[model samples]
Target: TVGLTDLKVRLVRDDFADAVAWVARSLPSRPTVPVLAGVLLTGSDDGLTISSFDYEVSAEVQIPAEIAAPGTVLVSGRLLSEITRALPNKPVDLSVEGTRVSLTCGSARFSLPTMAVEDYPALPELPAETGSVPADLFAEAIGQVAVAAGRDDTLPMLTGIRVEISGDRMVLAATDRFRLAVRELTWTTKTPDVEAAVLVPAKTLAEAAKTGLDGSEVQLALGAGPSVGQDGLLGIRSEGKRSTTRLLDAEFPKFRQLLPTEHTAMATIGVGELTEAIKRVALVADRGAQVRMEFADDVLHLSAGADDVGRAEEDLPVSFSGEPLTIAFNPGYLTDGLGALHSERVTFGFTTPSKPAVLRPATEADAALNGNGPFPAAETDYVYLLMPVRLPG
Candidate 1:
């Protein structure tokens, strides 16, 4: 057993603070296991390692440190976050004695009680690495699809982002039943011809992907052992930080079927102009009222109002074709879909009033502009499908 007394370490305050925050954020607020409320700090001649885990998600961060003495201890994750964040801009000194852990930086000093080390459960080891994704691209794709993931934990299946890998292509998808998002991207892979799918909790997966925004590529690994089973695990890492989360066991919805195979008509409009118009017109809408959009000829009209309140309307030029139609959508959700498209202009595909409408990059209009694809090539790479809201006459 590692001695609990005379345990000592010293490291730069900034580095230690960063390691604490990155790992502690994954610790549960209401921990089912008492030891989970505390973060494990293991110090050795090699370096200082900090870790925290809830059964659902685990995170660890390593930073260089000088070991005055070698040992391990546990301290409150929440308190450590606050303490480290407020420490003076100098080196941090940590020492353990009996059941208390001591920390000192410049003039600031703190002694926190340690949890029973024996009570702490072992964290799942990171799974074997699969491949890497362009850090920036992974972060962007997570932001796009995660917005459509369900927030209702009641139906847990709908709250996860579906990750599917086939050949060299990867598809990320999520939906809350009202709106669905799907993005396809190419990734470098070692497992060719291997088809696999996993569902990860949106909240954890989204935050984990956000960390990939760091300079290094994000390494992905699928769980294969105790860290994985019928209810698998996913590990993500970049530079100094890494995280693992249990995969959602329930089957993801048949998202492909939700995608519209064809459209009777489509319209292209400047994204900024239409987005601003939607915001202005939606001002008069009640809490859950719909914003109605009418497309005809080469003009797109938007209007919304409460029965007893004022009404608003705005018109913008559009490149439109096929039959004229009016569709009503929740202003907020529609705006979300539009913002996520990440393009100067957006395209809307229409089939009928009662059916779902699709949103794509205005590039889809390239098909009509030139003699190329009947649909835009890269624009269709990411698709957002939104169900229409029934309007009052």
Candidate 2:
């Protein structure tokens, strides 16, 4: 354990609490080593660094603090988080005394036992910056694609979001076999010829994306040679905080082939109307069953369940073209795609009832184009492809 002879520091209570809580969010529920659960605090002339590293992922934040004596200490991360949040509105004074750290804020006094700092592993250093994206847009895109990632751990490849960065274009895609979501956007690249594709755990990426600095940019750093079977890390850095997660080694499927180039029919529906209609009808669907939809003319019909238990039927006006179509879909998956669209109007592209259906945000130009031809190129390159449930014969 690293010894702390003289460590004294003072920090704003809210600043300390926020930094500790950020690190605690990624701490391992069951740490491999006891010290791995600890949050390491290092006070230096520059500032204070609060960090937590549990092998697979690490979260660290740098905050300005009043340093009387520069030193390092380790304490239970979760315990520190709770204490910091509960402390009254006052400056928090911390100093080392023997094997413990004494924290004083207002009239509250707590002595937190120090962990063995020497036992903690070093945090992975951030790699060379690959590129940057607007913080808000990055988080928004992550939410759009991550909804399709598989939760089943058996298929680790399906559980990750594939990140493809080429030039100024970056695409994020994730699939859970039953459905696939893809989002494409442009960002500033470090190099004019920069290009790389890597798979990162969706949960990790989403967690990191959710906490970026407001109205700023997020820098994405890639480890050297992050190829299959080599140790590689993806670092997410904002203004004052950063996180690093190891990249998945599995090869992502050739997802481009799955995207339909043409469709036999298309339907445009208001997102809110469709979502509410599905929810009302889904109440009658047998848990895990499908909701049937028939589209013709300008009317869309939705139904679920049968006469035995109960039945629900609803109809809404929509704009549809080409030959009539009947399709069945998992209501849960259907609504998931709709919610991610982030648009008032949604367009559906279909080849056949037995084939996968595509959902995209509708464009003003779409109304002028015939539905039978290729879908009008989306201004925002995003698509949610869902496999239709088989119709009961």
Candidate 3:
């Protein structure tokens, strides 16, 4: 029993779906609180708002809607996510009364109970915007660095990326101990001397970066003060959407010392061809096998597999200069480094097969001269240091 002017709103299906999907991305998969599993929707003459928070992370987005009468309601985010995704390609009508919410589309109708909004936790206001970066650049940089982040959840510190900012330079770094990726990008800060650092969950950072492309820029806001509580909190706002995350309470490894300063030999090869070779040969590597690479007088030999499985090998043209050295690597990891190089010619610099190898993009000068010397000391930015997988004795 409800009146037309009561708690009700009618809106286009696409608008509701978009808003739900936008905030639903941040919904906790394993919500600890009953109400934490719900999404709060606020309807007003000025579009509508949908938001979700699970303490660790929160999301909010605005979607345009036709409001018959302004109202607020809470519903299961997962349920709305499922319903919205399957709604017919037409406008939708929604209404709520006495803890009951109903949704109607074309010829279909469904009703569900709304959760108690009074118990919902208060969403923290977005902190002041400390700086901003081009959304696309930030996404790409995060993508490159996050590729090396540890996936072992038990070691929480290694599962996150360290974001450090000073002046106009922003650096993203992640590592799984065996491999380290560091990317540096430029950003604008409210205070040129602003110095800040935080550890963000790699998975959350990657998801946030993927959605940031919709906006021209992403604003980063962190209290100037250092972390306290569960730790410091970080908020990212891009256009009408925003996400907040509790900074991990752990110290990031000091990995800058891991970057090698020089190399005795180097091999520059096409990334496309190299990656394909890795894919084909990696198949024969079986599980946990390392792909072997031999650098010699005039050829670079790539091979995988042992006596148990079938052996596979291929040679790709490379400008190799140094002692003929054979090195084995976790194929999957090597490919990751090469894939993230984001250049046609990727140069691998090595001091010895027993030691680590450094990877860099082959610059125009190096590609033309086909230089196989140590990676230039001055050109040290964006270097990936990878430990060699010890071969079976």
Give the alpha-carbon lDDT of every model: 0.82, 0.85, 0.82
Q: What lDDT, from 0 to 1, does candidate 1 have?
A: 0.82
Q: What does candidate 2 score on TM?
A: 0.95
In Å, residue 97's CA in model 3 sits off its true spot by 1.8
Mark the regions of model 1 whose C-alpha exceeds 4 Å error after superposition: 1-5, 223-231, 364-379
The best candidate in terms of TM-score = 2
Positional deviation of 273 in candidate 3, in angstroms? 0.8
TM-score of each: 0.93, 0.95, 0.92
Worst 10 residues of 1 by lDDT: 370-379
Candidate 1: tens digits of C-alpha lDDT, residues 1-393: 365546799999889988898887788885677788999898876588898889889998888998888888888899999999899889999998687898988988899998887888887887777667888898889899998999998988789999887767889999999999999988866665556788989999887776534755888888333322333788888886888898887779897876777676678888998999999998887786788999877888888886588888888888887678888999989999999999898888877788999998876334365221233223477888999988775
TM-score comparison, 2 vs 3, better candidate:
2
Candidate 2 residue lDDT tens string, 1-393: 243456899999888988988899888885668888899998887578999998878899988999998888999988998899798879999998878999988889999998988777998888877888988888899999998998887898898999888888999999999899999989988767767888999988887777653448988887333432134788888886888898887878889899887778889899999999999999987787788989988799998887887889899998887778889999999999999999999999888899999999998777776545544335458899999998877
- 35, model 2: CA deviation in Å? 2.0
Error of 2 at 206 (Å): 0.6
Give the winner by TM-score: 1 or 3.
Answer: 1
Which ranges in model 3 have alpha carbons more than 4 Å from their true place? 1-6, 224-231, 368-375, 378-381
Q: What is the per-residue lDDT of model 3 for residues 223-252, given as tens digits with 9 covering 90 to 100?
A: 553321123778899888888887888779
